[PDB]
Amino acid sequence: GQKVHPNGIRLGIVKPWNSTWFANTKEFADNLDSDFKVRQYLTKELAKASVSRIVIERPAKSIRVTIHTARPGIVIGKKGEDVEKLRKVVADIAGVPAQINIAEVRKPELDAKLVADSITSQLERRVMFRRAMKRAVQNAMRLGAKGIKVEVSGRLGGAEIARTEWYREGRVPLHTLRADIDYNTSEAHTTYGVIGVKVWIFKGEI
Amino acid sequence: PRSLKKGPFIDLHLLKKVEKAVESGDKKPLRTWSRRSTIFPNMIGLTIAVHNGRQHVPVFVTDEMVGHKLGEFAPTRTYRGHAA
Amino acid sequence: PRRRVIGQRKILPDPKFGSELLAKFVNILMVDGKKSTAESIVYSALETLAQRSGKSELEAFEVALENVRPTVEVKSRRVGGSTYQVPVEVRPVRRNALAMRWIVEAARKRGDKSMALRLANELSDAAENKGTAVKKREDVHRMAEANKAFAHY
Amino acid sequence: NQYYGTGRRKSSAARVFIKPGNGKIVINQRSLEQYFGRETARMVVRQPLELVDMVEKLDLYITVKGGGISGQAGAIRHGITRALMEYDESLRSELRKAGFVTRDARQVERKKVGLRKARRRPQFSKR
Amino acid sequence: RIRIRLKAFDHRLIDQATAEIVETAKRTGAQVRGPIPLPTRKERFTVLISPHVNKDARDQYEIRTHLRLVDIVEPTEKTVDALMRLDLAAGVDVQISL
Amino acid sequence: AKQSMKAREVKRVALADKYFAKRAELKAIISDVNASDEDRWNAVLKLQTLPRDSSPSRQRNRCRQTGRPHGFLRKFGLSRIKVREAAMRGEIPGLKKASW
Amino acid sequence: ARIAGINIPDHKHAVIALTSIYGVGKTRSKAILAAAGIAEDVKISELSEGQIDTLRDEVAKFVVEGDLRREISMSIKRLMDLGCYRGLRHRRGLPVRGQRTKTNARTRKGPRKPI
RNA sequence: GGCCGGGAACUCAAAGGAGACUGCCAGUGAUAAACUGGAGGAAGGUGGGGAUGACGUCAAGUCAUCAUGGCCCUUACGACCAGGGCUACACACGUGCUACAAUGGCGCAUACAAAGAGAAGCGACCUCGCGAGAGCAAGCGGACCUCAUAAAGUGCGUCGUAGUCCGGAUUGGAGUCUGCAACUCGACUCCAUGAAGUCGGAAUCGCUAGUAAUCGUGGAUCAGAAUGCCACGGUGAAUACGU
Ligand SMILES: [Mg+2]
Ligand SMILES: [Mg+2]
Ligand SMILES: [Mg+2]
Ligand SMILES: [Mg+2]
Ligand SMILES: [Mg+2]
Ligand SMILES: [Mg+2]
Ligand SMILES: [Mg+2]
Ligand SMILES: [Mg+2]
Ligand SMILES: [Mg+2]
Ligand SMILES: [Mg+2]
Ligand SMILES: [Mg+2]
Ligand SMILES: [Mg+2]
Ligand SMILES: [Mg+2]
Ligand SMILES: [Mg+2]
Ligand SMILES: [Mg+2]
Ligand SMILES: [Mg+2]
Ligand SMILES: [Mg+2]
C-alpha cells in the first residue's frame, strides 16, 4: 500500500517545521511563494555544498534563513564573501532585508537528505546502485544510527523494466509516532530516465 | 435578462455599422459576430448576417424581432435526428 | 453476530403510564426519530380505546396484545435444495415485539383518516380476534402447525 | 445556602442550584412547564427528586445552554443528581443505581470522507 | 490602557511570548490582567491525494491559531517603549492597542 | 500548464491593474441612481471598448508553482498536489494532519 | 356557482374554489376575495347572489379562461413563426429553457420511444 | 436588557495536571496466559471516534499537476484573436434530489443548537419594493461586528382521502443581480400554468447506537453559478436466537 510521509505525520510530535512565521490569509500565499523562490535559488546555487535543510523565519518585515550544511566553509566562503552574495540575492527575492545564518551538519552520513543526495549523485556518475545503497547503509550504521532504510527505484542499471530495491538495517519503526525518523528523497537524472531515492534514518525514540 | 436600469446591451461596433447602414440607405448584408447584441428598432429592414460558429447566416430583421438577441436567429448546433 | 457481545439497551418507560412495554410500542410506531409525534398518536389511540372498552389504557393494550402474541413460528432451513420451515418456540420478548410490530403494520394499512384512529380501531379489533394483526398471528400459527413434523429440523 | 451541580448531555450544559424550599423549579427564568412542553423532558428533570422522595423539600433554580430538548433535560437531571449529593452524600448509591450519576458520553459521530454520514455509505453497484 | 493581542500557530511559543510581555509591564510597575486564553481557531483543508481520480482518497489538514490577550492597566512611561523592544520570537504576531 | 497559459494569466492581471480605476468610474455611473440616460448609456459603451482582459473576472486562479487551473486553494496559492507536497515537508507553517 | 364561464365548486372554501378558473392561482384568489370583502374560509354555497356578482366583477379585472388561452397561444405561435431558438425548441417539442436533453427532458419529450 | 457598579463563584475559553492499569475482589483455568462476573468510578476491559495501511498483488491509475528517457512537430502539433463547442438527444446505465401525502399540506403564534467564514470581504439599523433586491450607511481583520430567526418541534385553526388545499415538472408573461457580456448557456424573484407520480418487475444497496432514519446549519471552489463534496449540530429508533 501507500505510506504516510514520515516527516509530515511527525510534524508536531517530534519533528519541527522548516518554515516558522505567522501570517494572515492576506500574506500567506505570498510568503509561501517567496519561500519557494528563496529555497529554489539556494538549492541551485549551493548544489555542491551538501545543503540538507533550509529553515526560513520571518520575524518582523524581514527574513532570516538558516542553511543546514555539512560543508559550511564552501557556503561562508572567503571571509564571508559567498554568504554576502547569497544574502543580497535572498533580500532581493523576498523584497525584505535578509539575514542568512549557517548551521553546521556534523555527521552528514546520518542525515537523510545528504545520504539521498550522495546516492543520486553516485547514480548519475554510473556507480552501481547496489554498491551506493550498501555503502550508505553501512556508513549510517557505523556512525551510530539505530536504523536506516534505503530505497531506490527506476530503470536500475539501465534495465528496460523498472524495479524497486531496498535495504534495511536496525530498526525503522515507521508507525511509532515518537520515533525520530529522518526522511528525505532525491532524484537521479540518468540517461535512462529518473531514478528515485528514499532514505529513512532512525535516531532513537523520543 | 439584463437589468432594465442598465438599458439594453449592444456592441458599439455593430451599433455604428447599423447607424451607417441606415444612413447610406444601404441593404448590403451586415457581417457581424455580435450574437449578444439586442435587436433595436432602427435595425428593422436591414439584413444582418450573424455568425453561428462557422458561417454568417442572413437575418432579415422585422418588427417582431425587436428586443431579442441576434444570436436567437442563428442556431449554432446542427441536428437532423438520430437513426436518420 | 458471531461473537455474542450484544445486550439490552436501557429503555425509558413512557411518561404517562410508566410502562416499558408502551415505550417499546411508541418506538415501534415512530418514524424518522419523531418520538413526540408517535407518543401523541399512541396516547390518543389508547384514550379512545379505553373510552370504547371501559377497561383502562394499559389493560386494553394488554388484552389486544394477548390476541396477537405468537407462541410458535417457523425458521427456514435449507436441506436438499428444499427449505425446511422448522417450527420453533417464540421467546417472550420476541412475542411482545412481533405482536406490537404486527399491530402497527396492520393499523398502517387501515382506511381510517388519522393514524390514532386507525391504531385505536386495530387495538379494538385485536381485543376480539378480528384485525389483520390477529390474522397474521393465525397464519403464523397455522404455518407452524403444518410443519410440526419437522421439529428436529 | 445553595448546593450546586453541573450537568452535561450531548452539547448541553446545565447549572443547577438547589436549596431548601417547597418545590419551585425555574429553568432559564421560566417555569418547568413553560420551558419544556415535552412530557418525556419534564419527567427526566423530575426523575432524581422523585427518587430521593424530595419533590417538595428543596427549591430548584436552573440555567441551561446548548443542545436541544432531550440534551438539556438530561444535562439537568445530571446536574440535579450532582446537586443532591452535595446536599447529602448518603443518597449517592441510590442515584448511581438509577444510572443518574453517569455522564452519558454519547455524542454525534463526525462525518467521514467517502461516507454520506458517519456510517452511511454511498450506494454500491457491481457493474 | 494597553491591549496586547498575540496570535501563533504554536502554543508553547505563544505561552512564552505572552509571558515575557507581562514582566516588561510589571518592572515598569504597571498592573496587568490575564493572559486571557481566547478561543483557538482551527482552519481545516481537505484535499485529494491522487494526482488523478480516486475521489475517496483525501488528506485532512488544519492550522490551529492560538490567541492570548494581555491587558496593561495604567502604564508607566517606559511601558510602551520597553513593551516596544522586548523583541518577541518569530512566529508570534503581536498587535498592541491603545 | 503551458507557458502561454501562464503568460495569459500575467497579461490579464496586469491589464486589470491598469484599468481598475477607469472601470470603477464607468460602473458607479452605468449604475448610478442619478445619471443622464446618455451619460449612463455612454458608460455602457465606453465599458466594452476597454480591453476584455482588464476585467478581473477573466482571471483564473492557478497554482503558483505549476499553473494548475483546478484544485486551487486561495490560502496557499497552490493546487491540492503542491499543497500536499509542501505540507509534508514542513514548509507550510502551522499546518499538520488533522484528526477530530 | 358560475364565474368566468365555468362552474366552481360550491363545497370548497372561497380561496380554493376560485382557483378553478384558468388564470387564478392562490395569490390572485386572495386578492379577489380581499377586494370583494368576502372571507377566505367561506364556502361558495353559502354566498349571496350579490356576493357572487361582486366576485364576477373582481374576476373581470383579470385576463382569464379563453382570453388567457388565446394570449398564451399567441405568444407561443409568435415565437414559432419568428424562427428564433425558443420558437424552434417549441416546434420540435424539446425543452425550451436550456435544460439538459442527453437525459431526462421527459415532460417535453413524453414517454420513451424505443429504437 | 449582565443593563450599570461590581463579583471570580458557576458556564465557558485554553494552558498545565489527575484519571483506566484486568489496578482491586470472587470464581474458572495447566501453581500460566486468559476468561466470566462484582465493587468503586464520569468512564471497564482497545471506553467512543480519528489519524496511522507490513512484504507484496493487479505491466492497476496518472507522460493532461509536476518532473522525466525516448520519439515526434518547429512560418506549426508553436502563438494571438472573435464567434461556436465541451450544455447536442431515437436511446441504455450509474450516483443523487423531489415526491406520490393526513406520523401530512397550508395559515397564525412560539421554544431549543453546533460548527464555520469575512477586507476588491462580511455587511447591520433605517427607507423603498409583493419579492428577488435597491438606496443610504454603522460595526468588524472579529468570544465584541456581520453572515444569522435553525429546522424538525410545540399550541391553535383548517383541509377530510380527492390526482386533492398532495406533487411542483413544464411552459407564457414580468423582473432582479453578478458580470465588458446571461441567444446558444446563469442564479434568483413575482403572476399565471399545475405534467408524471396513488409507494415502484426481475433484481439490488446502506446501516449494530447517539448508528440508521429524519431535520436544519456552515465551508472550500467561486464575479456569478450545488440536489455534488467536505464539515456541523437537533430529534432519534428496530434488531442481532445464532453460524
Ligand atoms: Mg511546461
Ligand atoms: Mg472564473
Ligand atoms: Mg442547466
Ligand atoms: Mg465491571
Ligand atoms: Mg497501530
Ligand atoms: Mg496499463
Ligand atoms: Mg493522454
Ligand atoms: Mg461535461
Ligand atoms: Mg402544495
Ligand atoms: Mg463562502
Ligand atoms: Mg473566526
Ligand atoms: Mg396519472
Ligand atoms: Mg391517496
Ligand atoms: Mg461495525
Ligand atoms: Mg441535508
Ligand atoms: Mg460561490
Ligand atoms: Mg446528523
UniProtKB/Swiss-Prot annotation, chain A:
Signal peptide: none annotated. One of its GO terms (molecular function) is rRNA binding. One of its GO terms (biological process) is translation. The keyword RNA-binding applies. GO terms for cellular component: cytosolic small ribosomal subunit. Keywords: Ribonucleoprotein, Ribosomal protein, RNA-binding, rRNA-binding. Gene3D superfamilies: 3.30.300.20, Ribosomal protein S3, C-terminal domain. Residues 38-106 form the KH type-2 domain. Binds the lower part of the 30S subunit head. Binds mRNA in the 70S ribosome, positioning it for translation. HAMAP family: Ribosomal_uS3_B (MF_01309_B). Part of the 30S ribosomal subunit. Forms a tight complex with proteins S10 and S14. Belongs to the universal ribosomal protein uS3 family. This is Small ribosomal subunit protein uS3. The lineage of its organism: Bacteria, Pseudomonadati, Pseudomonadota, Gammaproteobacteria, Enterobacterales. The gene is rpsC.
Curated annotation (Swiss-Prot), chain C:
Signal peptide: none annotated. GO terms for molecular function: mRNA binding; rRNA binding; structural constituent of ribosome; tRNA binding. InterPro entries: Ribosomal_uS7, Ribosomal_uS7_bac/org-type, Ribosomal_uS7_CS, Ribosomal_uS7_dom, Ribosomal_uS7_dom_sf. One of its GO terms (cellular component) is cytosolic small ribosomal subunit. The keyword rRNA-binding applies. It comes from the Bacteria. Transmembrane segments: none annotated. Gene3D superfamilies: Ribosomal protein S7 domain (1.10.455.10). SUPFAM superfamilies: Ribosomal protein S7. Keywords: Ribonucleoprotein, Ribosomal protein, RNA-binding, rRNA-binding, tRNA-binding. GO terms for biological process: cytoplasmic translation; negative regulation of translation; ribosomal small subunit assembly; translation. Coiled coil: none annotated. One of the primary rRNA binding proteins, it binds directly to 16S rRNA where it nucleates assembly of the head domain of the 30S subunit. Is located at the subunit interface close to the decoding center, where it has been shown to contact mRNA. Has been shown to contact tRNA in both the P and E sites; it probably blocks exit of the E site tRNA. The strain K12 sequence is shown. Has been predicted to contact the N-terminal domain of IF-3 based on footprint studies; exactly how IF-3 interacts with the 30S subunit is controversial. Belongs to the universal ribosomal protein uS7 family. Part of the 30S ribosomal subunit. Contacts proteins S9 and S11. Cross-links to IF3 and the P and E site tRNAs. This is Small ribosomal subunit protein uS7. It comes from Escherichia coli (strain K12). The gene is rpsG.
